[PDB]
Amino acid sequence: MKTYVPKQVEPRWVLIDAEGKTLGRLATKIATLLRGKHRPDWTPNVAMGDFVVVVNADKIRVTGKKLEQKIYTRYSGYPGGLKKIPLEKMLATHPERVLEHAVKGMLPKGPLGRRLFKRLKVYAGPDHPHQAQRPEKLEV
Amino acid sequence: AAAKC
Amino acid sequence: MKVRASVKRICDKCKVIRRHGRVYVICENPKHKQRQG
Amino acid sequence: SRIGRLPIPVPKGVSVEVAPGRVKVKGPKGELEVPVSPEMRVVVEEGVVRVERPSDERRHKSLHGLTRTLIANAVKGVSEGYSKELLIKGIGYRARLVGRALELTVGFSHPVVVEPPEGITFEVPEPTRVRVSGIDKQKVGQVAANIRAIRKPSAYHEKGIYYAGEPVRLKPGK
Amino acid sequence: MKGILGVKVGMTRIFRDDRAVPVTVILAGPCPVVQRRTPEKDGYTAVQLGFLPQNPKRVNRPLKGHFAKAGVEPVRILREIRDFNPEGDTVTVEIFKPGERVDVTGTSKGRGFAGVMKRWNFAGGPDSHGAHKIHRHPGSIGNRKTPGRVYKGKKMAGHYGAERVTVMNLEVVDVIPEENLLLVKGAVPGPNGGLVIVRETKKA
RNA sequence: CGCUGAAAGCAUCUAAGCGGGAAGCCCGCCCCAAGAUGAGGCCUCCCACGGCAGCCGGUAAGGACCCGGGAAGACCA
RNA sequence: CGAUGUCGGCUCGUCGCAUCCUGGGGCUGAAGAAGGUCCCAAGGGUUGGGCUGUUCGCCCAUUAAAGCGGCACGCGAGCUG
Ligand SMILES: [Mg+2]
Ligand SMILES: [Mg+2]
Ligand SMILES: [Mg+2]
Ligand SMILES: [Mg+2]
Ligand SMILES: [Mg+2]
Ligand SMILES: [Mg+2]
Ligand SMILES: [Mg+2]
Ligand SMILES: [Mg+2]
Ligand SMILES: [Mg+2]
Ligand SMILES: [Mg+2]
Ligand SMILES: [Mg+2]
Ligand SMILES: [Mg+2]
Ligand SMILES: [Mg+2]
Ligand SMILES: [Mg+2]
Ligand SMILES: [Mg+2]
Ligand SMILES: [Mg+2]
Ligand SMILES: [Mg+2]
Ligand SMILES: [Mg+2]
Ligand SMILES: [Mg+2]
Ligand SMILES: [Mg+2]
Ligand SMILES: [Mg+2]
Ligand SMILES: [Mg+2]
Ligand SMILES: [Mg+2]
Ligand SMILES: [Mg+2]
Ligand SMILES: [Mg+2]
Ligand SMILES: [Mg+2]
Ligand SMILES: [Mg+2]
Ligand SMILES: [Mg+2]
Ligand SMILES: [Mg+2]
Ligand SMILES: [Mg+2]
Ligand SMILES: [Mg+2]
Ligand SMILES: [Mg+2]
Ligand SMILES: [Mg+2]
Ligand SMILES: [Mg+2]
Ligand SMILES: [Mg+2]
Ligand SMILES: [Mg+2]
Ligand SMILES: [Mg+2]
Ligand SMILES: [Mg+2]
Ligand SMILES: [Mg+2]
Ligand SMILES: [Mg+2]
Ligand SMILES: [Mg+2]
Ligand SMILES: [Mg+2]
Ligand SMILES: [Mg+2]
Ligand SMILES: [Mg+2]
Ligand SMILES: [Mg+2]
Ligand SMILES: [Mg+2]
Ligand SMILES: [Mg+2]
Ligand SMILES: [Mg+2]
Ligand SMILES: [Mg+2]
Ligand SMILES: [Mg+2]
Ligand SMILES: [Mg+2]
Ligand SMILES: [Mg+2]
Ligand SMILES: [Mg+2]
Ligand SMILES: [Mg+2]
Ligand SMILES: [Mg+2]
Ligand SMILES: [Mg+2]
Ligand SMILES: [Mg+2]
Ligand SMILES: [Mg+2]
Ligand SMILES: [Mg+2]
Ligand SMILES: [Mg+2]
Ligand SMILES: [Mg+2]
Ligand SMILES: [Mg+2]
Ligand SMILES: [Mg+2]
Ligand SMILES: [Mg+2]
Ligand SMILES: [Mg+2]
Ligand SMILES: [Mg+2]
Ligand SMILES: [Mg+2]
Ligand SMILES: [Mg+2]
Ligand SMILES: [Mg+2]
Ligand SMILES: [Mg+2]
Ligand SMILES: [Mg+2]
Ligand SMILES: [Mg+2]
Ligand SMILES: [Mg+2]
Ligand SMILES: [Mg+2]
Ligand SMILES: [Mg+2]
Ligand SMILES: [Mg+2]
Ligand SMILES: [Mg+2]
Ligand SMILES: [Mg+2]
Ligand SMILES: [Mg+2]
Ligand SMILES: [Mg+2]
Ligand SMILES: [Mg+2]
Ligand SMILES: [Mg+2]
Ligand SMILES: [Zn+2]
């Protein structure tokens, strides 16, 4: 007998409120859902995880002195092109990148892992435009 | 061609 | 401001305080101001 | 050996109103809100406010004495109010009101005009005496500090803006 | 923030208070408002200006429809002036008064493939003392095994000019409104007959 | 460098909170830039063609080819 | 060692900061002016000549200043020799 492999199913859409949640501990759960390892038919070479919608990403929470000391970094290829942006400056300018960056570093590297990142849709504020897909509110 | 002497 | 690795009281009116993660000596004598560093 | 547990006299008729992390102090001169740790407890008694801490850990002992004074300063602010006096010293140095503003002639090429923020009132009795009056003890001390910095006391001559009661400490220049 | 489209006419100089004033003449007027960008519809504020009337025989149907929605004769050039909401439906040189300071944007003259000396003011090589076929060469472009490569943005030979250049804070010497003429003190990018854009200065 | 202020009846720029403060930092200025595959937005134009998410033609709005050239340019653009 | 071209110069830079200058400070045996000393700060700037192959150094005339270092003592499929 060979191991079961699943046909293609229509994937579940899901919603998570980030407000007051801890950054890394929410990301860890989003990654799992995006990989779809919460499903018993999980298969490592196909995008069959869930689509994850996050509202209130601006209201993510962090411990310690990380608002002023966690430095996101960008290198441009040029002499001196190392850019440092502290967490609060990011939260104040592009607050959704905080949780996107956190989730992306926990996803597999490679083509599939990039596809799975695209199934993540993160919004500052209480609202999201995916009402067409009617995502299911999850608690985590 | 110069030398490594 | 004296900046050194060994900061101590220099006179009896010196005060060792810890502000903002650093050890300072403060004093009515401004020569005695010390920061640890 | 304590400040937190010392109760606060409330004059007639000041009202102290308690709320989550805030106390409101209304009195004859105005209102003040005093943000206070939810780890503390502010207790309204007869003509008296008390503060209690819920442990003997260093943070709770520190917020305790802190919260009590903050409220006591506000109770005093809305009744007696707060003031601080500045003495100008220097041969050509003086100050005058221009409407609500404070104008300092303190030896620069130009005069300095300090304008009063809300709750701050400048009183210039004599050309060498300025008073900063308001209910907020912190704000009054901050504005006063600003004014003094405009021309600090000289290290060598009795010249500049001084606090009242501020000693004159000079050193020899020869 | 006001602006207008124009054409570089040429240089001359005038006399003003017993001084020669180098000027560049610009023909700026008149520019019909063809579309206004609004926060509601476009997310920002700007006025799409027209400039120079065009032979309607050369204006295809997508563009003809665009002019029609404005009731405006077909125009050669469409450029937006950003953050500008003129009152009327036409912009003329009158928006500038003598004494004001303007920013002028044009397309510089194109040097084509340009050497490191013309393009980047490099020193080149010596012309005698044994210099061997390197008189206009750039010299070293790197280090050795560390980093073992050449930086991005490295100054090298390549195309030069025919690029957008803005020269800033130019004095409006005169405005001759009957000819749609603006006179600006100093130099302005590009060749005679080039398209230019005249904005109120951002210098203060 | 301060204000207010405990712990620690005093004191303390600090532990709660608030000010001031560099040619440096972020923005601002100038240029590039949606292959930003996360490929964005606006204005306008054409339009359901014919034959067994595919094919086959003939078309639309448009475009290219070719030509006359150009302070654009190595060719290309 | 079936080869990793070795000094200085030239050219082109780029980085570090233990900072030469310029900006901000504290202390001074800081009157003012000018200095000393330490702290912060790498954004930009950091001259032209005489001698010697020189690196280095000395000298001339200036300068806000005439910094010190890493990059195979940066760079000879870039030049010189
Ligand atoms: Mg099976
Ligand atoms: Mg969580
Ligand atoms: Mg999978
Ligand atoms: Mg999957
Ligand atoms: Mg934090
Ligand atoms: Mg692996
Ligand atoms: Mg000692
Ligand atoms: Mg003391
Ligand atoms: Mg032009
Ligand atoms: Mg243009
Ligand atoms: Mg051109
Ligand atoms: Mg030219
Ligand atoms: Mg050319
Ligand atoms: Mg050249
Ligand atoms: Mg040249
Ligand atoms: Mg050039
Ligand atoms: Mg040369
Ligand atoms: Mg030459
Ligand atoms: Mg020659
Ligand atoms: Mg030779
Ligand atoms: Mg050669
Ligand atoms: Mg030759
Ligand atoms: Mg070369
Ligand atoms: Mg090599
Ligand atoms: Mg080499
Ligand atoms: Mg490398
Ligand atoms: Mg070109
Ligand atoms: Mg340019
Ligand atoms: Mg000028
Ligand atoms: Mg005139
Ligand atoms: Mg005319
Ligand atoms: Mg006290
Ligand atoms: Mg104090
Ligand atoms: Mg604090
Ligand atoms: Mg501050
Ligand atoms: Mg101050
Ligand atoms: Mg552009
Ligand atoms: Mg696109
Ligand atoms: Mg674009
Ligand atoms: Mg894709
Ligand atoms: Mg897509
Ligand atoms: Mg991307
Ligand atoms: Mg898309
Ligand atoms: Mg598009
Ligand atoms: Mg958009
Ligand atoms: Mg084409
Ligand atoms: Mg040609
Ligand atoms: Mg061509
Ligand atoms: Mg050809
Ligand atoms: Mg050709
Ligand atoms: Mg061709
Ligand atoms: Mg060998
Ligand atoms: Mg061999
Ligand atoms: Mg070999
Ligand atoms: Mg060999
Ligand atoms: Mg170097
Ligand atoms: Mg340092
Ligand atoms: Mg300095
Ligand atoms: Mg200084
Ligand atoms: Mg002095
Ligand atoms: Mg002296
Ligand atoms: Mg000093
Ligand atoms: Mg110091
Ligand atoms: Mg620097
Ligand atoms: Mg020299
Ligand atoms: Mg000679
Ligand atoms: Mg020589
Ligand atoms: Mg020498
Ligand atoms: Mg020697
Ligand atoms: Mg000197
Ligand atoms: Mg100097
Ligand atoms: Mg070498
Ligand atoms: Mg060297
Ligand atoms: Mg070499
Ligand atoms: Mg050679
Ligand atoms: Mg050599
Ligand atoms: Mg080599
Ligand atoms: Mg070689
Ligand atoms: Mg080479
Ligand atoms: Mg080689
Ligand atoms: Mg020889
Ligand atoms: Mg020889
Ligand atoms: Zn002392």
Coordinates of all heavy atoms in Angstrom, one line a residue, chain G residues 58-76:
Chain G
rC58 P 59.0 65.6 10.3 OP1 58.9 65.9 11.8 OP2 57.7 65.7 9.5 O5' 60.0 66.7 9.7 C5' 61.3 66.8 10.2 C4' 62.2 67.5 9.3 O4' 62.4 66.7 8.1 C3' 61.8 68.8 8.8 O3' 62.0 69.9 9.7 C2' 62.6 69.0 7.5 O2' 63.9 69.3 7.7 C1' 62.6 67.5 7.0 N1 61.4 67.3 6.0 C2 61.6 67.9 4.8 O2 62.7 68.4 4.5 N3 60.6 67.8 3.9 C4 59.5 67.2 4.2 N4 58.6 67.1 3.2 C5 59.3 66.6 5.5 C6 60.3 66.7 6.4
rC59 P 60.9 71.0 9.8 OP1 61.2 71.8 11.1 OP2 59.6 70.4 9.7 O5' 61.1 72.0 8.6 C5' 62.4 72.4 8.2 C4' 62.5 73.0 6.8 O4' 62.3 71.9 5.9 C3' 61.4 74.0 6.4 O3' 61.7 75.3 6.9 C2' 61.4 73.9 4.9 O2' 62.5 74.6 4.4 C1' 61.7 72.4 4.7 N1 60.4 71.7 4.5 C2 59.8 71.8 3.2 O2 60.4 72.5 2.4 N3 58.6 71.1 3.0 C4 58.1 70.4 3.9 N4 56.9 69.8 3.7 C5 58.7 70.3 5.2 C6 59.8 70.9 5.5
rC60 P 60.5 76.3 7.1 OP1 61.1 77.6 7.6 OP2 59.3 75.7 7.7 O5' 60.1 76.7 5.6 C5' 61.0 77.4 4.7 C4' 60.3 77.7 3.4 O4' 60.0 76.5 2.7 C3' 59.0 78.5 3.6 O3' 59.2 79.8 3.8 C2' 58.3 78.2 2.3 O2' 58.8 79.0 1.2 C1' 58.8 76.7 2.0 N1 57.8 75.7 2.4 C2 56.7 75.4 1.5 O2 56.7 76.1 0.5 N3 55.8 74.5 1.9 C4 55.9 73.8 3.0 N4 55.0 72.9 3.3 C5 57.0 74.1 3.9 C6 57.9 75.0 3.6
rA61 P 58.2 80.7 4.7 OP1 58.7 82.1 4.7 OP2 58.0 79.9 5.9 O5' 56.9 80.7 3.9 C5' 56.8 81.2 2.5 C4' 55.4 81.0 1.9 O4' 55.3 79.6 1.4 C3' 54.3 81.2 2.8 O3' 54.0 82.5 3.1 C2' 53.2 80.5 2.1 O2' 52.7 81.3 1.0 C1' 53.9 79.3 1.4 N9 53.7 78.1 2.2 C8 54.5 77.6 3.3 N7 54.0 76.5 3.8 C5 52.9 76.2 3.0 C6 52.0 75.1 3.0 N6 52.0 74.1 3.9 N1 51.0 75.1 2.1 C2 51.0 76.1 1.2 N3 51.8 77.2 1.1 C4 52.7 77.2 2.0
rU62 P 52.9 82.9 4.3 OP1 53.0 84.4 4.3 OP2 53.3 82.1 5.4 O5' 51.5 82.5 3.7 C5' 50.6 81.8 4.4 C4' 49.6 81.0 3.5 O4' 50.3 79.8 3.1 C3' 48.3 80.6 4.1 O3' 47.3 81.6 4.2 C2' 48.0 79.4 3.2 O2' 47.5 80.0 1.9 C1' 49.3 78.8 3.0 N1 49.6 77.7 4.0 C2 48.8 76.6 3.9 O2 48.1 76.4 3.0 N3 49.1 75.7 4.9 C4 50.0 75.8 5.9 O4 50.1 74.9 6.7 C5 50.7 77.0 6.0 C6 50.4 77.9 5.0
rU63 P 46.4 81.6 5.5 OP1 45.4 82.8 5.3 OP2 47.2 81.6 6.7 O5' 45.5 80.3 5.5 C5' 44.7 80.0 4.4 C4' 44.2 78.6 4.5 O4' 45.2 77.6 4.7 C3' 43.3 78.3 5.8 O3' 42.0 78.7 5.6 C2' 43.4 76.8 5.9 O2' 42.5 76.1 5.0 C1' 44.9 76.5 5.5 N1 45.8 76.4 6.6 C2 45.8 75.3 7.3 O2 45.1 74.3 7.1 N3 46.7 75.3 8.4 C4 47.6 76.3 8.8 O4 48.3 76.1 9.7 C5 47.5 77.4 8.0 C6 46.6 77.5 6.9
rA64 P 41.3 79.6 6.8 OP1 40.0 80.0 6.3 OP2 42.3 80.6 7.3 O5' 41.1 78.4 7.9 C5' 40.5 78.7 9.2 C4' 40.1 77.4 9.9 O4' 38.9 76.9 9.3 C3' 41.2 76.3 9.7 O3' 42.1 76.3 10.8 C2' 40.3 75.0 9.7 O2' 40.1 74.6 11.1 C1' 39.0 75.5 9.2 N9 38.8 75.2 7.7 C8 39.2 75.9 6.7 N7 38.8 75.5 5.5 C5 38.0 74.4 5.8 C6 37.3 73.5 5.0 N6 37.3 73.6 3.7 N1 36.6 72.5 5.6 C2 36.7 72.4 6.9 N3 37.3 73.2 7.8 C4 38.0 74.2 7.2
rA65 P 43.7 76.2 10.5 OP1 44.4 76.6 11.7 OP2 43.9 76.9 9.2 O5' 43.9 74.7 10.2 C5' 43.8 73.7 11.2 C4' 43.4 72.3 10.6 O4' 42.2 72.5 9.8 C3' 44.4 71.8 9.7 O3' 45.5 71.1 10.3 C2' 43.6 70.8 8.8 O2' 43.5 69.5 9.5 C1' 42.2 71.5 8.8 N9 42.0 72.1 7.5 C8 42.6 73.2 6.9 N7 42.1 73.5 5.8 C5 41.1 72.6 5.5 C6 40.2 72.4 4.5 N6 40.1 73.1 3.4 N1 39.3 71.3 4.6 C2 39.3 70.6 5.7 N3 40.1 70.7 6.7 C4 41.0 71.7 6.6
rA66 P 46.9 71.9 10.6 OP1 47.4 71.6 12.0 OP2 46.7 73.3 10.1 O5' 47.9 71.2 9.6 C5' 48.1 69.8 9.4 C4' 47.2 69.3 8.4 O4' 46.5 70.4 7.7 C3' 47.8 68.4 7.3 O3' 47.0 67.4 6.9 C2' 47.9 69.4 6.1 O2' 48.0 68.8 4.8 C1' 46.7 70.2 6.3 N9 46.7 71.5 5.6 C8 47.6 72.5 5.6 N7 47.3 73.5 4.8 C5 46.1 73.1 4.2 C6 45.3 73.8 3.3 N6 45.6 75.0 2.8 N1 44.2 73.1 2.9 C2 43.9 71.9 3.4 N3 44.6 71.2 4.3 C4 45.7 71.9 4.7
rG67 P 47.5 65.9 6.6 OP1 49.0 65.9 6.7 OP2 46.8 65.4 5.4 O5' 47.1 65.1 7.9 C5' 45.7 65.1 8.3 C4' 45.6 64.2 9.5 O4' 44.2 64.2 9.9 C3' 46.0 62.8 9.3 O3' 47.4 62.6 9.3 C2' 45.2 62.1 10.3 O2' 45.9 62.2 11.6 C1' 43.9 62.9 10.4 N9 42.7 62.3 9.7 C8 42.2 62.8 8.5 N7 41.2 62.1 8.2 C5 41.0 61.2 9.1 C6 40.0 60.1 9.2 O6 39.0 59.9 8.5 N1 40.2 59.4 10.4 C2 41.2 59.6 11.3 N2 41.2 58.7 12.4 N3 42.1 60.5 11.2 C4 41.9 61.3 10.1
rC68 P 48.1 61.5 8.4 OP1 49.6 61.7 8.5 OP2 47.4 61.4 7.1 O5' 47.9 60.1 9.2 C5' 48.3 60.1 10.6 C4' 47.6 58.9 11.2 O4' 46.2 59.1 11.4 C3' 47.7 57.6 10.4 O3' 48.9 56.9 10.6 C2' 46.5 56.8 11.0 O2' 46.9 56.2 12.2 C1' 45.5 57.9 11.2 N1 44.5 58.0 10.1 C2 43.4 57.2 10.1 O2 43.2 56.4 11.0 N3 42.5 57.4 9.1 C4 42.7 58.3 8.2 N4 41.8 58.4 7.2 C5 43.9 59.1 8.1 C6 44.7 58.9 9.2
rG69 P 49.3 55.8 9.5 OP1 50.7 55.4 9.8 OP2 48.8 56.1 8.2 O5' 48.5 54.5 10.0 C5' 48.0 53.6 9.0 C4' 46.8 52.9 9.6 O4' 45.7 53.8 9.8 C3' 46.1 51.9 8.6 O3' 46.8 50.7 8.5 C2' 44.7 51.8 9.1 O2' 44.6 51.0 10.3 C1' 44.4 53.2 9.5 N9 43.9 54.0 8.4 C8 44.6 55.0 7.7 N7 43.9 55.5 6.7 C5 42.8 54.7 6.7 C6 41.7 54.7 5.8 O6 41.5 55.4 4.8 N1 40.7 53.7 6.1 C2 40.9 52.8 7.2 N2 39.9 51.9 7.4 N3 41.9 52.8 8.0 C4 42.8 53.7 7.7
rG70 P 47.0 49.9 7.1 OP1 48.1 48.9 7.4 OP2 47.2 50.9 6.0 O5' 45.6 49.2 6.9 C5' 45.2 48.1 7.8 C4' 43.9 47.6 7.4 O4' 42.9 48.6 7.5 C3' 43.7 47.1 5.9 O3' 44.3 45.9 5.7 C2' 42.2 47.2 5.7 O2' 41.6 46.1 6.4 C1' 41.9 48.5 6.5 N9 41.9 49.6 5.6 C8 42.9 50.6 5.5 N7 42.6 51.5 4.6 C5 41.4 51.1 4.0 C6 40.5 51.6 3.0 O6 40.7 52.6 2.3 N1 39.4 50.8 2.8 C2 39.1 49.6 3.6 N2 38.0 49.0 3.3 N3 39.9 49.2 4.5 C4 41.0 49.9 4.7
rC71 P 45.1 45.6 4.3 OP1 45.8 44.3 4.3 OP2 45.8 46.9 3.9 O5' 43.9 45.5 3.2 C5' 42.8 44.5 3.4 C4' 41.7 44.8 2.5 O4' 41.2 46.2 2.7 C3' 42.1 44.9 1.0 O3' 42.0 43.5 0.4 C2' 41.1 45.8 0.4 O2' 39.9 45.2 0.1 C1' 40.8 46.8 1.5 N1 41.6 48.1 1.4 C2 41.0 49.1 0.6 O2 40.0 48.9 0.1 N3 41.7 50.3 0.5 C4 42.9 50.5 1.1 N4 43.5 51.6 1.0 C5 43.5 49.4 1.9 C6 42.8 48.3 2.0
rA72 P 42.9 43.2 -0.9 OP1 42.6 44.2 -1.9 OP2 42.6 41.8 -1.2 O5' 44.4 43.3 -0.5 C5' 44.9 42.8 0.7 C4' 46.2 42.0 0.5 O4' 46.0 40.7 0.0 C3' 47.2 42.7 -0.5 O3' 48.5 42.4 -0.1 C2' 46.9 42.0 -1.8 O2' 47.9 42.1 -2.8 C1' 46.7 40.5 -1.2 N9 46.1 39.6 -2.1 C8 44.8 39.6 -2.6 N7 44.5 38.6 -3.4 C5 45.8 37.9 -3.4 C6 46.2 36.7 -4.1 N6 45.4 36.0 -4.9 N1 47.5 36.3 -4.0 C2 48.3 37.1 -3.2 N3 48.0 38.2 -2.5 C4 46.7 38.5 -2.7
rC73 P 49.6 43.5 -0.4 OP1 48.8 44.6 -1.0 OP2 50.7 42.8 -1.2 O5' 50.2 44.0 1.0 C5' 49.3 44.3 2.0 C4' 49.4 45.8 2.4 O4' 50.3 46.0 3.5 C3' 49.8 46.8 1.3 O3' 48.9 47.9 1.3 C2' 51.2 47.2 1.8 O2' 51.5 48.5 1.4 C1' 51.1 47.1 3.3 N1 52.4 47.0 4.0 C2 52.8 47.9 4.9 O2 52.0 48.9 5.1 N3 54.0 47.8 5.5 C4 54.8 46.8 5.2 N4 55.9 46.7 5.8 C5 54.4 45.8 4.3 C6 53.2 45.9 3.7
rG74 P 48.2 48.4 -0.1 OP1 48.8 47.6 -1.2 OP2 48.3 49.8 -0.2 O5' 46.7 48.0 0.1 C5' 46.2 46.7 0.0 C4' 45.1 46.6 -1.0 O4' 44.2 47.7 -0.8 C3' 45.5 46.7 -2.5 O3' 45.9 45.5 -3.0 C2' 44.3 47.3 -3.2 O2' 43.4 46.2 -3.5 C1' 43.7 48.1 -2.1 N9 44.1 49.6 -2.2 C8 45.0 50.3 -1.5 N7 45.1 51.5 -1.9 C5 44.3 51.6 -3.0 C6 44.0 52.7 -3.8 O6 44.4 53.8 -3.8 N1 43.1 52.3 -4.8 C2 42.5 51.1 -4.9 N2 41.6 51.0 -5.9 N3 42.7 50.1 -4.1 C4 43.6 50.4 -3.2
rC75 P 47.1 45.4 -4.1 OP1 47.3 43.9 -4.5 OP2 48.2 46.2 -3.6 O5' 46.5 46.1 -5.4 C5' 45.4 45.5 -6.2 C4' 44.9 46.4 -7.2 O4' 44.3 47.6 -6.5 C3' 45.9 47.0 -8.2 O3' 46.1 46.1 -9.3 C2' 45.2 48.3 -8.6 O2' 44.2 48.1 -9.6 C1' 44.5 48.8 -7.3 N1 45.3 49.7 -6.5 C2 45.3 51.1 -6.8 O2 44.6 51.5 -7.7 N3 46.1 51.9 -6.1 C4 46.8 51.5 -5.1 N4 47.6 52.4 -4.4 C5 46.9 50.1 -4.8 C6 46.1 49.3 -5.5
rG76 P 47.6 45.5 -9.5 OP1 47.6 44.2 -10.2 OP2 48.3 45.5 -8.2 O5' 48.3 46.6 -10.4 C5' 47.8 47.0 -11.7 C4' 48.7 46.8 -12.8 O4' 50.1 47.2 -12.5 C3' 48.9 45.3 -13.2 O3' 47.9 45.0 -14.2 C2' 50.3 45.2 -13.8 O2' 50.3 45.4 -15.2 C1' 51.0 46.3 -13.1 N9 52.0 45.9 -12.1 C8 53.3 46.3 -12.1 N7 54.0 45.7 -11.1 C5 53.1 44.9 -10.5 C6 53.2 44.0 -9.4 O6 54.2 43.8 -8.7 N1 52.0 43.3 -9.1 C2 50.9 43.5 -9.8 N2 49.8 42.7 -9.4 N3 50.7 44.3 -10.8 C4 51.8 45.0 -11.1

